[PDB]
Structure formats: C-alpha cells, structure tokens
Amino acid sequence: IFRYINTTLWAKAGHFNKALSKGAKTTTWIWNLHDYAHDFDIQQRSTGLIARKVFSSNLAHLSLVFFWISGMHLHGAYLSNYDIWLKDPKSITPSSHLAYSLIGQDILNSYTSEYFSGITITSGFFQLYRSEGIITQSQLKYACATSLIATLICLSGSYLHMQLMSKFTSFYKKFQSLSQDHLIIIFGSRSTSLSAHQIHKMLPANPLLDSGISKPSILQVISNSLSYTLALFSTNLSSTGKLLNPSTRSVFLSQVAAHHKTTGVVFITLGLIRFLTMYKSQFSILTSYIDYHIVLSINLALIASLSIIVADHLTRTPIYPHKSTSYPTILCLSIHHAWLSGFLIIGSGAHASIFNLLGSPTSEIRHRDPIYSHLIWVCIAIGLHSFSLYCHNDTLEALGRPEDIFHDNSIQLKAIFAKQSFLRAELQPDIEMLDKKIIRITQELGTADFIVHHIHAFTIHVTLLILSKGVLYARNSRFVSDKLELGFTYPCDGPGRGGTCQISPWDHLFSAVFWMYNCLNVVTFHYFWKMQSDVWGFVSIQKHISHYSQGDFSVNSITINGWLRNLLWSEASQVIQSYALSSICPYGFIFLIGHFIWAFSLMFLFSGRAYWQELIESILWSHHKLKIIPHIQPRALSISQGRAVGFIHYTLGGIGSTWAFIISRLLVLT
Amino acid sequence: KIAYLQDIPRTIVEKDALELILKNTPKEQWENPPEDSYLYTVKAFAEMYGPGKATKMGWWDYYRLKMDMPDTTRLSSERELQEIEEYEKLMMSGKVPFAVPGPSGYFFTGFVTQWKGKEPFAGDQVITLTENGLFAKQFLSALAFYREGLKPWQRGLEIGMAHGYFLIGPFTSLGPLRNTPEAATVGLLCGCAIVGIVSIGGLIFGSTIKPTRFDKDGDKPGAGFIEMINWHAVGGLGGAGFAHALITVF
Amino acid sequence: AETEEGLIIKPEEAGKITSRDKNNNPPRIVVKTNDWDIPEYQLSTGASNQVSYITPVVESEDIKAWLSLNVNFFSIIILFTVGGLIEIQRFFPDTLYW
Amino acid sequence: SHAVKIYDTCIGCTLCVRACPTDVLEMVPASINAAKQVASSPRVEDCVGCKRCETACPTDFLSIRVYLQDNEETQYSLGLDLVDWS
Amino acid sequence: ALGLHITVLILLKGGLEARGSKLMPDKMEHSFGFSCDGPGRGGTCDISAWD
Amino acid sequence: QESSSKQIRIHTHKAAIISHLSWVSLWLGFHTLAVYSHNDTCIAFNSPSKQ
Amino acid sequence: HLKTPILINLWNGDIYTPLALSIVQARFIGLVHFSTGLILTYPPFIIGATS
Amino acid sequence: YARFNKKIKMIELRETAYGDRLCGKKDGLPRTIATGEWNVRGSAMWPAAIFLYIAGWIGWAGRSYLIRTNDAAKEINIDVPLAVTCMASGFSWPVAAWQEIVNGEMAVPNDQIHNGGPWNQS
Ligand code: CLA
Ligand code: CLA
Ligand SMILES: CC1=C(/C=C/C(C)=C/C=C/C(C)=C/C=C/C=C(C)/C=C/C=C(C)/C=C/C2=C(C)CCCC2(C)C)C(C)(C)CCC1
Numbered sequence A: 001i002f003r004y005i006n007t008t009l010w011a012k013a014g015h016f017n018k019a020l021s022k023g024a025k026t027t028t029w030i031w032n033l034h035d036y037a038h039d040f041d042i043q044q045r046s047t048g049l050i051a052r053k054v055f056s057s058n059l060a061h062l063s064l065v066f067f068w069i070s071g072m073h074l075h076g077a078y079l080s081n082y083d084i085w086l087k088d089p090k091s092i093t094p095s096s097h098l099a100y101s102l103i104g105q106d107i108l109n110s111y112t113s114e115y116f117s118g119i120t121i122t123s124g125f126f127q128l129y130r131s132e133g134i135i136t137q138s139q140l141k142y143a144c145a146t147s148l149i150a151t152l153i154c155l156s157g158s159y160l161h162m163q164l165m166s167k168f169t170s171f172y173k174k175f176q177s178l179s180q181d182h183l184i185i186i187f188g189s190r191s192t193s194l195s196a197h198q199i200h201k202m203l204p205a206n207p208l209l210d211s212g213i214s215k216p217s218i219l220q221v222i223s224n225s226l227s228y229t230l231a232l233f234s235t236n237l238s239s240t241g242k243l244l245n246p247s248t249r250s251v252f253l254s255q256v257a258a259h260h261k262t263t264g265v266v267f268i269t270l271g272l273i274r275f276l277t278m279y280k281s282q283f284s285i286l287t288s289y290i291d292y293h294i295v296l297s298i299n300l301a302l303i304a305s306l307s308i309i310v311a312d313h314l315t316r317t318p319i320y321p322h323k324s325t326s327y328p329t330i331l332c333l334s335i336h337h338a339w340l341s342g343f344l345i346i347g348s349g350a351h352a353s354i355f356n357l358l359g360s361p362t363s364e365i366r367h368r369d370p371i372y373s374h375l376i377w378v379c380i381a382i383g384l385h386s387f388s389l390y391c392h393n394d395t396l397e398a399l400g401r402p403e404d405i406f407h408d409n410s411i412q413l414k415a416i417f418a419k420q421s422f423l424r425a426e427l428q429p430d431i432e433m434l435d436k437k438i439i440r441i442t443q444e445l446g447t448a449d450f451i452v453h454h455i456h457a458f459t460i461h462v463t464l465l466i467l468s469k470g471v472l473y474a475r476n477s478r479f480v481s482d483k484l485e486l487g488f489t490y491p492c493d494g495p496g497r498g499g500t501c502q503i504s505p506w507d508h509l510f511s512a513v514f515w516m517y518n519c520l521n522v523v524t525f526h527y528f529w530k531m532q533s534d535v536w537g538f539v540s541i542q543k544h545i546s547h548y549s550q551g552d553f554s555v556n557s558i559t560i561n562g563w564l565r566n567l568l569w570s571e572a573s574q575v576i577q578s579y580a581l582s583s584i585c586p587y588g589f590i591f592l593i594g595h596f597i598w599a600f601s602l603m604f605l606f607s608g609r610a611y612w613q614e615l616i617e618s619i620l621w622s623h624h625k626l627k628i629i630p631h632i633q634p635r636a637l638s639i640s641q642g643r644a645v646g647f648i649h650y651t652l653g654g655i656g657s658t659w660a661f662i663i664s665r666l667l668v669l670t
Numbered sequence B: 001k002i003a004y005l006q007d008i009p010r011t012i013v014e015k016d017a018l019e020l021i022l023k024n025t026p027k028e029q030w031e032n033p034p035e036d037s038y039l040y041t042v043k044a045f046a047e048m049y050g051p052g053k054a055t056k057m058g059w060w061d062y063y064r065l066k067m068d069m070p071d072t073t074r075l076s077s078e079r080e081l082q083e084i085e086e087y088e089k090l091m092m093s094g095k096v097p098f099a100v101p102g103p104s105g106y107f108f109t110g111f112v113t114q115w116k117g118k119e120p121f122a123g124d125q126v127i128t129l130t131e132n133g134l135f136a137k138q139f140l141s142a143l144a145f146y147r148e149g150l151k152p153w154q155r156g157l158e159i160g161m162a163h164g165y166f167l168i169g170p171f172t173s174l175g176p177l178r179n180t181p182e183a184a185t186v187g188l189l190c191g192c193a194i195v196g197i198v199s200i201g202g203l204i205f206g207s208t209i210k211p212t213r214f215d216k217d218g219d220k221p222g223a224g225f226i227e228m229i230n231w232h233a234v235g236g237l238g239g240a241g242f243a244h245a246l247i248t249v250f
Numbered sequence C: 001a002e003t004e005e006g007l008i009i010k011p012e013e014a015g016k017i018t019s020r021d022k023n024n025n026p027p028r029i030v031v032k033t034n035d036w037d038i039p040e041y042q043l044s045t046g047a048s049n050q051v052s053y054i055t056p057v058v059e060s061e062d063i064k065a066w067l068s069l070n071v072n073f074f075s076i077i078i079l080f081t082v083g084g085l086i087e088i089q090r091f092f093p094d095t096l097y098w
Numbered sequence D: 001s002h003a004v005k006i007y008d009t010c011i012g013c014t015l016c017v018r019a020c021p022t023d024v025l026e027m028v029p030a031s032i033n034a035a036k037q038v039a040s041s042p043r044v045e046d047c048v049g050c051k052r053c054e055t056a057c058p059t060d061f062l063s064i065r066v067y068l069q070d071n072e073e074t075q076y077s078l079g080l081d082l083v084d085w086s
Numbered sequence E: 001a002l003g004l005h006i007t008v009l010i011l012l013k014g015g016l017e018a019r020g021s022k023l024m025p026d027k028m029e030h031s032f033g034f035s036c037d038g039p040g041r042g043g044t045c046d047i048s049a050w051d
Numbered sequence F: 001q002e003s004s005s006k007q008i009r010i011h012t013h014k015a016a017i018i019s020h021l022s023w024v025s026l027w028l029g030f031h032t033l034a035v036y037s038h039n040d041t042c043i044a045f046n047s048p049s050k051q
Numbered sequence G: 001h002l003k004t005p006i007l008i009n010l011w012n013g014d015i016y017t018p019l020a021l022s023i024v025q026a027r028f029i030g031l032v033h034f035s036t037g038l039i040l041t042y043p044p045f046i047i048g049a050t051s
Numbered sequence H: 001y002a003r004f005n006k007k008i009k010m011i012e013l014r015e016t017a018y019g020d021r022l023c024g025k026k027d028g029l030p031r032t033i034a035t036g037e038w039n040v041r042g043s044a045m046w047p048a049a050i051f052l053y054i055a056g057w058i059g060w061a062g063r064s065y066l067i068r069t070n071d072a073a074k075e076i077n078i079d080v081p082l083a084v085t086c087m088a089s090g091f092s093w094p095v096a097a098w099q100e101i102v103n104g105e106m107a108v109p110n111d112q113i114h115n116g117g118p119w120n121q122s
C-alpha cells in the first residue's frame, strides 16, 4: 500500500500534469508548473486520486494552522510581556514579538513595560489568553505543546490518507453523514464542551482576577479548587449585553458560557430536527451541487459572511476582557476579518464560475440577461446617487453655498431605518467607560452615515455584478458562443468581433478583486474614521467626551475633500512623521513600501506581454552574442499571469499602505 | 439476471440498501457499473466475497468496505427520484416551476408558467408575468404611446401633461431658490426648460430615425412622430403651468 | 519484493486457493486498480499478521536529485548568501572600517 | 470585413480550417506540398477575426495571416446578435 | 537620467521594431496602431508601435 | 543586406542598441532605488550618518 | 433597451449599434485620462504651495 | 538596559570612526568619494573593485555552466558537482575572460545568431 510512496517523483518536477511532461522548454513551463500545483482536477489519474489529494491537502493545511497557533503560543510564553499585561493590562501594550539588534533594527522595539521592549502586537492574543484563564507560563507551554502535537497528528493523517483512501473510497461523498456528524458533534457537542471549559476554568479564574486577586493565592485558588464560588456568581440579573463587566469592560464570562451551552443545545436539536424538516425544494440544489468546486464556493461564501459578521461583532459587542479599551486591537480585529470576508467572497465567486464550467449549471442561468441587467441598472443608480451626493456637497461647498449641501446642518438625509433600529443593543441612555477610555457609546447615525452606507451598498453591488456576470456568462454568451470549450481561464478569444479581451470567468474575478478591494477600503476608512470621531477617545470627569478625531466625521465626511484632508492627510501625520520614532519606524517604512508595490503593479496592469517579449528577445540577442544561451528559453509572462501579478501587487501594496496608516496612528494615539 | 447481484451476503450490504442502490442507479449501468459508483464497489467486492468465495475478511478491510458502501441514508428515495424525474421533464418541456427571489434564495410559488414563447428560439419572447401577463399586456397596450384610437396629438398631449406636471416638483423644492418667496416660478421655468429640451431631443429623433408607426397612410414619413413630439411640448407646458397654478392657489 | 511470501492470488480464485503462506496468513486478493499511485490494492481473506510498512520508500540518490533541482540549489545558495550578509553585519556593524 | 490571406508555405495541416468558428477557411487541392492541398479563405466576409487559425498554424511564420480592418467592420465581422444590419 | 533612458528605450524599440520583430515578423504590413496579434503564439497584447 | 541608408545601419544592429539601452536603464534604476532605499532605511533607524 | 416597452417600438439599435470601445481606442482613452489627471493635478499643488 | 548600553557604545564608535570621513559644511552627513581617489575615507574605488570582481565571478561561473551543459534538462535539474566546479573555477575570470575575448572564444559573429525581426523584403 505505502510501498508506492516514493521520492522518485520529487526530482521529476511537473509530473502531476500531462501538459508539463514535454519538459521545461521555456520559462512559461515554470509558471504553469506553479499554476497547476493545486489544480487536482486537471492532474493525472482517476477521480479517487482527486479525493485523496483534496482531503490530505485539507489535513496538511490544518496542520499548518495548528503550527501557526503553536508559534503564537510559544511567543506568548517565552517572548512576551504577558505577565505584566496580566498584572496591569490598562498600562501595558501587548507584545509577544521582538526584533533582533541588527542593522539598528533595535529601533523597532519600543517601551511596552519597564522590563520589556518589543513590537506592540495587535492580534488580541493576550485578551484571548486572559479570557481563556491562562495565567502562568506553564499553561502557555502546554498550550504550545498541545498545538505542536496537533500539528504532528494532522501532518501524519495527511500523509496516511493518501494511501488509506483508495479507488473504492466514498466517505467524502456521504453528504448526509458529513452534515449530521459535523452539525451535532462539532457545533453542538463541542460548543457545550467549550461551555464546560468556561464554567470550570474561566468563572473559577476570571472572577478571581476581577475580584482584585491577581495574586489568586497563586495556585491555592487559581488552580481550580473553588467550588464555593457558584457558576452564576456575578450575573447581576439584567440582560446579557445591557450591563457590561465594569472591571474588564466586557460581557460577563458566565453569560458567554451560558451562550455556548445554549448554542450547543440548539445545534444538537437542529441535528435531531434534520431527521424530518423542510425539504423537496432545495432538492434540485441538493442533487446538482454535489461537486468539489460548488461546495467549495458555498463554504467560501458562508465563511466570508461569517467573517464580516465577526468583524462587526468583535468591536461593539465586547466579549474579551480589557479588549474594548485596547483600540489598536479592536481596529485590527475588525479590519482583518473585513478583508478576509472580501477575499473569501471573491473566491466563492471564482469557484462558482469553475463549477459552472466543469459541472452543469442550474435554472437561474437561462434568464441571466434580466438578472445581470437589473444588477447593472441598480449599480448605475446607486453609483450615480451615493457618490454624487459627495460630489454635490463638494461642488456646493467649494462654491461657498453650504446651505445647499447634504449635511445635518443643511438638506439632511435621515437614516430612517437605522434611527428606528434601536432594537440592536437597546442599552440604557448613557455610555460605558473603564479607565480614561470609552468602552462603547452608541454611534449616532446621521446624514454622513447614510451616504457612506449607500456607498458601501453601491460598491458591494458592483462587485456582485462582476462576480455574477462571470458566473452566468461562463459557458457561453452572445459575444462568444463556445466559451465552454475555451476552459475556465483564458486571456481572450482574439482581437475579433471588435475585441474579446477578458471574457473568461478568471478575468471576471480579476476585475472583481479590484472592485472588492475598493469596496472594503471604504469600509475600512468608514470604520477607522467613525470610531475615532464618535466612539473612541478620552473622557472628562464632568461627563464630557474628547474623542480622538474631535468629531470630524459628521462635519467633514460629507465631502470628498473632507476624506482627503481630515482622514488621509491629518490622520496620516502619525505614519508620515514616524522615522526614528521607536515603535512606528517599520510602519512608516512599510507605508513607503506599500506605495512602491502598488505603483509597481501598474507596470503589469497597463502593459501587454508582446512588448516585454520583444524586449526579452532583444536582450537574448546580447546573451547569445557572448555564448550565454539559456536553454529554458526566456518567455514573457502569459497574459493571464501578467494580470494575476498586477492584481496581487496592487492589492498587496494598497493593503500595506492602509495597514501602516491605521496601525501607526492607533499605536501613537494609544 | 445479473450474476453479482444474486445471493450477495447481507454483511457486504443490506437488502434494503442494495435495492435503494439499484433504484438510484440507472438500469443500463447494472451490468457494468461505471467507476466511483457505489454499485461499482458492490460488484468489485461481491465477486470476491460470498458463499462460494472468500467468506472472511480482515477487520480493517471490512472496516474500509463498510465506509465505501452507502449508509442507507445518502440515497434518494422513490419520491425524491420522482421529484427529479419530473422537475427535469418540466424544465426540458419549456415550462418553469415559478420561483421568486427572496433573502438570498427563492421561494417556489407552486405555479407552472410556460416559459418558451410562441417562437421557442426567440430570446425576447420568453413570456414572464410582468410583461406577458394579462394585466401587464393590457396596461402596456393602454398607455398613451400604445392606446388604440388616439390621434398622435392626443398621445403627445397626454404624455406631455404627465411630464410637465411631474417635472415642476424637483425644482420648486430642493432647488437653488427653494426658500425664496416665489420658489415655484423658478421651478415652473426649469420644468418648462426640461420639457423643451426633451422635446428638442424627440424632434432630433424624429428627423434622424423617423419612426413611421404613427404616420397615417400616404404622409411624409415621421410626420406622426413629429406631431406627437410637438404636442408633448405643448402638453408639458400645460402640465407645468397647471402644477404651478395648483401650488400657488393652494 | 516486499511481498516475497504472500500467496497472492487473483480475484478469479478468491474461494479456490487455500494454501496459506510460509506464515499462516491466508492468501491475499490482488486487485489491479488503474491508479498509478495505487496500482494494486491487496485484500485479505482472514486474520493475518501481515507486515505492511507505513513508512515511505525514499533513497539517498533521488533525495539528492531533488536537492539538485534548480529551486533547492538556488535557494540554498541564496539562503547562505543572505545569512552571510547578516552575519557580516552582526560582526562588522556600521562599516566602521570603510 | 477582415482580410485572411493564405501563403505558399502552407503544408495542408487542415488545423486552420478546423479551428475557424465561422467556416471561413476551406481546403483546396494543390501541388506545392507533400499533402497536395493548401488552405483557402473564400468566405472572409464571415471572418470575425478571432485569429484561432493563426494560433493553429504550425509553420515557422503563419501560412495564414489575418489582417484586422476596424474601419471596415460589418455585422458579420462584429458578431452582432442584438442588432441586425440587413 | 533613468527616466529619460527608459522613455528613449521604449520609443526607440517601438521605432526599430515597428517594421517587424521576432515575435511578429510582418508588422509593417499592418497599420501603425492595431489591437494585437491574437492570444496564440504566446499572447500578443500591446504589440503595435502605437502600443 | 545593402547597408547604405542610415536607418538600414541602425536596423542591422538594433538588438545591440536595445540591449545596451536596457542595460543602462537597469543599472540606473537598480543603483538609484537601492541607494535611496539605503538612505530611507538608515534614516528610519535613527542613523542619518549611515547614509 | 430592446426589451423595454417604449424603447423597442422606436429604436431597434440597427442604426448606431452600441458597442464597447475597440482595444486601441480603449488604450488611448485610458492614456488620455491618465495624462490629463497626472498633468492637471500638479498646477493646483503648485499654486497652493507657492502662492 | 544592557542592550541600550551596547547600542550607545555602537553609536559612539560610529561617531569616532567617521571622524576622518568628509562631510558637508552644512549637513554634517559624511560623504562618499567617487572621484577615483583610492586613498580617502569613504572612497568608492574599493567597493567598486570588490563588487566588480565578485560580479564577474558570478557571471563567469554561470556562463561556464551554461557552456558545459548545453541542454535544457541540465538547467532545471542542476548538475550540482559541475555547478560547484564552475563556481569554484570562476575565481580566475579577469584573466580567462580576457584570454577568451582576444582569442575569439567569447563573442560570436552577428551572422550566427538571430539578428532580429525583418525590416524589409518586398
Ligand atoms: C479554501 C480556499 C481555497 C481553495 C481550496 C482553492 C483552491 C483552488 N483554487 Mg482558488 N481562490 C481562493 C481560495 C481557494 N482556492 C480565493 C479566496 C480566491 C480569490 C483570490 C481564489 C481565486 C482563484 C483563481 C482565480 C483560480 C483559483 C484556482 C484554484 C485551483 C488551483 C489553485 C492552484 O493551483 O494555485 C496554486 C497556488 C498558488 C499559485 C499560490 C501562489 C500565491 C498567491 C497567488 C499570492 C499570494 C501572495 C501572498 C498572500 C503575499 C506574500 C507576502 C509578501 C510580503 C511577500 C484550486 C482548486 C485556479 C484554477 O484553475 O482553479 C481550477 C484559478 O484560476 N482560485
Ligand atoms: C549566467 C548568468 C548570466 C550572465 C552571464 C548574464 C550576462 C549578461 N546579462 Mg543577464 N540575465 C540573467 C543571467 C545572466 N546574464 C538572468 C537569469 C536574467 C533574468 C532576470 C537576466 C536578465 C537580463 C536583462 C534584463 C539584461 C541582461 C543583460 C546582460 C548583459 C549585461 C550585464 C548585465 O546587465 O548584468 C546584469 C544582470 C541582471 C540584472 C540579471 C540578474 C543576474 C542573475 C540573477 C544572475 C544569475 C546567474 C546564475 C544564477 C549563475 C548560476 C551558476 C551555477 C548554475 C553554476 C550580460 C551579457 C543586459 C543586456 O542585454 O545588456 C547588454 C540586460 O538588459 N540580463
Ligand atoms: C408613488 C407610487 C407609485 C407611482 C405613482 C406615479 C407614477 C404617479 C404619477 C403621477 C403623475 C405624473 C400625475 C400627473 C398628473 C398630471 C396632470 C393632472 C396634468 C394636467 C395638465 C393639464 C390639466 C394641462 C392643461 C393645459 C394644457 C393641456 C395646455 C394648455 C394649458 C392648460 C393648462 C390648459 C406606484 C404606483 C408606482 C406605487 C407606489 C405609489
């Protein structure tokens, strides 16, 4: 069985694809080898190998994630100031990340504690550890050990399943079994397990810390043995979320444990219900969507939506102790999950297109013109409406006519449904604050919030237009009637019919990545400006609030010039003036590098490969002149690869620019 | 009958599960199951293990076999197979089980709207409720542009009255002089200007495209359309003036 | 090679061959699958203490061949070059000698 | 309409004919190659211009050359579907 | 100097290969500006001298 | 082959022209961007005197 | 447009058929936009900085 | 605190080491001499010589390997013994390269390599 696991193919690069068997005649062979590496569908051998590869690769990636978790745990146990952060979280910035004293890189470590200098981490791992009752270094040691053991176990399982599974293997196709066991045993039987963990280790510990005994009598009290504290020790009646814990500025962990217990019960009951529930309508979906790419797209869309829900729920539904006051942590936790939501949504669209090209589509593709046409009209309507309210405000403010602009002190567009959406939270008529820092105050939504929400809707709709147009017009179109034979990813069909560049679903993803990036850059900026202007900030003992941006949002965000001046210029002073400043030197440098990479992408985005091919031939003349012949013949990047490289550099550079801009400012202000 | 489907031990697969497999699998595939089909594994094992053959297996081999066979719940029942065999029949017959999009999904309305039009290969004749229903057809036919028995000037007058009456509002309110004591004569002038501009555009259209669907027999081509556009301008003036009169008086 | 004594038999004689082995393991059915990674899947006829290694089959020659691949060669050389630059910077910082 | 020209270097592959999506090309008998056949383009009025024929041609430089003429486009050379020019 | 060199490089390459390059050895039969030479032969976006 | 016109003589060795123009462009870009990056990095690291 | 009630009975698109810009036209229009933006963004900066 | 003491010592050593280096009368930042002086602090002649030697070494090793492996299979699966042999042999590049230049073994006549695209025929 395992005697066929041989290294003889390690030296034979490109073995998996039969199109690469001719050998590396040109440099295009290298890029094709890298491109087809994970494309198990088109690789050689039967369908059973596809299942084995998919499952074992999933296990290998799971081992990789476990290794990353183990690295974070070891950094927290042996390369961090988590001790002093535990003792005083409101005066110590989290830091489990040092820099070596080479090339003066010592300037990157900054004062986080009197005994520690390092890079302020914004992953929120310290708050997670405190919410996980991790106090001693031994606990982090054993967490790291368990994560390393999990890495080894998952790696070994990925190794084994390449030969345990065979041609007869069918457990992956049993979707009823997968859904039932997943749902019940994981969402139900593991949620209650975490509820048990919290009830037996957090409530014995986190109340002890909040009770002021950071000593906890060392292990005499902290090491469990506290069955005289009661599970609902400090619920204080009320409703979950209406009253926060005054000490840690978060929801009481007893309520979180009850939530996990009840959610596990609900999931178990739903698994029991699924024995007899509503069906026979999603049944066409049931039979037509049993394929790798469709389920991958469905899961990607679902996980991305969950990621955006997490992004919006991690900030002003504070669960973690001492996390609402840690403003850089809140900002990072929102924005990182926002970006992941966008990226995984785009991936869902791509794999929907791939499923359409490999499998057979459904009924909705036959009236695709009305669908992707009313989508076009709605995109045009909300683009010519949302953005232009900004253009109108801008023009009339430049003209000196502020009474004719869309503002609160002018023609005002009230957010009617949001203002009547006091259902969410429904907190008492005041704010909450822990230590000179605002925990959460209700965002008073006005005209600017209305306009920016419509901008969000417009960008979302345009990205969805690109994605659905790629998906629905994958097999064929009025433009080209045999797009199915062209495959999933192709540069074009030729300069004929006026020009057929970028008709493939791959190119539709290529444009959709740009539009998703543009969509949630505005989301990032809206969050980053709104929180600073209207939520975060200092306090005055006379109940007066001094925010970080001093309420710039409601008065400046009504015009594009307001965004340019009060957000991208005034709030970029921290990152731009960050040279020789200990903590924020890398952020200024990375700001510069992000600008460089973003501009560098434009060389690939704007140019075609024929010019570069001719230039490469001109250079190859000089190489052949001096008897330097590369027998792997130099070829310029393929059209699809040029577009991919351009998109990757564009998004990476822009994301790095925002990343530095937000993080350096929040680190300086805090 | 087929050789390997007879006297198959229950331990390899149960009787009801095997019958469910045979029902789900198309009849032509029983003799030689394809590959990666539960019936293929049933054939590849029932021809090795049985009464006259190897009657025992290693525990791990039997464990792997039990995870290659269906678990009696992942197979469509008779009613589900009927659902598919009839849904596909509807779809191929040119009829669509009517569904309406909802919150990321669609509700089936339990209606069979015949989908392909009179010209089945025509893309714009696929009949929908909003364009080919009785109400939609009679509403479109009764519009001023389509109403039977209307002289071209009557269509123009009606359309112009509608446009002129409506166009006053966006200017007299939220306009540059929305707060001035008059604030409505400005809106009247702007609405009349919009009516005149669109009437000029219609005249351009009638002198360039020259639609001939309103011309009476033996007339200068496009004369009906030009008359309709001129009377739309007149009706726009009238409707704008009437809206302004109502605003000022009331 | 690794099955020098297995009494390996074909599907056609699943219940015909009974001569067990040099051990007492019953004969094993060999199924010729078409997968290149699993060309032959062997099925048992009963309880057996068969030695089936889970370790892979690697050798020094093709491991060296893999390390002779241009990626590994040009990654080892560039890694050593970068490490040498870093070590030189640690040992002679700020290029004071210049 | 474009201009699709066939040159003497043709070796009677028939690949250009098979790759054409609008039946512009055809095989005619000839005596200038071992295949005794060369391509021809009798119906370039239906040539959309996809240049698949050029992709399929294996001669050193294409024996079939498609010259794009954008100020010449007809309804057939544009692949018009929603609109008729006749 | 870098900017001037690269601008002259692009312009001079376009001028010298306007009548034919190794990739498209018939470029003087076509217009000064034309779309491309098709996705085949490796892909030929931005191949004209106008490009 | 008649190397009489000036454009002819330029076209005979056009590959040499373009290759050397590419070389000088690459040199200028590499050694300007790299020195600018050195200065940026060493001045971000509180060392103006290491430029 | 060919599906909207009133438009279809006045304009079938056979006269001035709407088509996407050709490849060379697209490149030129993008170049014009890029050049206009890059050039005309500077004089406001010059006037704001010097005056 | 100890690491900052080490950093302070490094800074003071940098101050005393750059004392002989020339800096402008208005910036204070030491300058690099690119006049070919060969005998001043911060001169660019020594780094230029070192880099040119090692860069010619790299190029010569690569060219030697390409000449001795006239195959595409040897470029993806590097013949490591031959590769390191050429890498070690590249030290004598300033002499071997010139001896090949003058003896007609480096360059190739233009009539043996593809000149470029045709510019005429008719
Ligand atoms: C669970 C997630 C998941 C999974 C399993 C897959 C799986 C697959 N995808 Mg896919 N995809 C995903 C998410 C996922 N994708 C997302 C989120 C997107 C949106 C961006 C896409 C977009 C996408 C496209 C457009 C295509 C695929 C394709 C494929 C298939 C082959 C992939 C391959 O060989 O690439 C090999 C792997 C690589 C080339 C990785 C290279 C690294 C990337 C490109 C750059 C990342 C830069 C990095 C983040 C930053 C560097 C740090 C910097 C500081 C240096 C395979 C079925 C291809 C296909 O043909 O499908 C059949 C294809 O054309 N996917
Ligand atoms: C054997 C390696 C080798 C050699 C001897 C040369 C030699 C030359 N190249 Mg060159 N080149 C190479 C590899 C090599 N190249 C590679 C891999 C690339 C792809 C990035 C290029 C890209 C390139 C361009 C774009 C240009 C040249 C140019 C030139 C000429 C001027 C010198 C120059 O610009 O150098 C500078 C060289 C570079 C910037 C490329 C990077 C150098 C690579 C990384 C070295 C690789 C060596 C290899 C790994 C050795 C392995 C040995 C081992 C297997 C034993 C000169 C004839 C120029 C020219 O034609 O002007 C006359 C020019 O414009 N080259
Ligand atoms: C919102 C709504 C809707 C819609 C509605 C509409 C669309 C309305 C319209 C309305 C309109 C749009 C109206 C109009 C009216 C008009 C009028 C009523 C006019 C009148 C006029 C006149 C009366 C004039 C006269 C004259 C002339 C003719 C000329 C001379 C002068 C004079 C003045 C005499 C719907 C259903 C969808 C749904 C929900 C609700």
Ligand code: SF4
Pocket: D006, D009, D010, D011, D012, D013, D014, D015, D016, D017, D038, D039, D053, D056, D057, D058, D059, D062, D063, D064
């Ligand atoms: S593909 Fe080219 S060589 Fe072959 S028959 Fe057609 S024109 Fe001739």
